């Protein structure tokens, strides 16, 4: 991404190196780690960190083609009011063994929506959780077991739906959850 490539370009100036991103991983709400390598030797990776600008969260991407043509995890930055995310840390919300994101409401009318979320490993790839789902109005209303992702639909109604949040069950293959609300049909 523009952001992860910039991390590599800035990392290479001190040695005149022509570095490009190999892959990149979200490590928190706004932080990410990039692995960089010289254009002439994809094998010579080095690790470097970045942080998304104010008002933006890290957004994990998958199967993004890098400079050498390999499809890899990548990271970009997205407005913090368009993405849900959480890792297992102290000021993550914990409920009944689950890590829960912030809760919020879209500003649309009565519409069918999709609640899309995935869990990710520490290496930035899709992972696996024993249980993941979403809360509505502060209560667990949907869950799905032993998966990397969820995408239930829902007839959103602003009069009855005050908030949604996503949750996952942390484990060796579930470090971060990332979710969005989207129009569906």
């Amino acid at each position: 991404s523009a952001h992860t490539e910039s991390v590599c370009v800035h990392a290479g100036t001190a040695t005149g190196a022509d570095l490009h991103w190999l892959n990149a991983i979200c490590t928190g709400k706004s932080t990410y780690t990039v692995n960089c390598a010289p254009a002439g030797n994809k094998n010579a990776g080095s690790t470097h960190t970045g942080t998304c600008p104010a008002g933006q969260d890290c957004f994990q991407l998958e199967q993004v083609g890098n400079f050498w043509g390999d499809r890899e995890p990548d990271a970009t930055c997205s407005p913090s009011n368009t993405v849900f995310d959480a890792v297992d840390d102290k000021e993550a919300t914990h409920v009944n063994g689950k890590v829960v994101t912030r809760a919020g409401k879209p500003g649309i009318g009565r519409k069918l929506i999709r609640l899309k979320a995935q869990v990710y490993r520490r290496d930035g790839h899709y992972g696996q959780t024993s249980r993941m789902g979403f809360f509505r109005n502060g209560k667990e209303v949907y869950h799905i077991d032993n998966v990397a992702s969820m995408e239930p639909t829902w007839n959103f109604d602003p009069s009855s739906d005050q908030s949604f949040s996503f949750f996952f069950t942390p484990g060796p293959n579930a470090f971060r959850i990332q979710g969005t609300l989207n129009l569906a049909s």
């Binding site: 849900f84 809760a103 919020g104 409401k105 879209p106 649309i108 609300l181 129009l183």
Partner: peptide, 23 residues
Amino acid sequence: EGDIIGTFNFSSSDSQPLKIHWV
């Protein structure tokens, strides 16, 4: 004759994430 070689894609942005108002 006049057939265009290649691929067109007219996709919209309606699938974009919705803006969220947090509680």
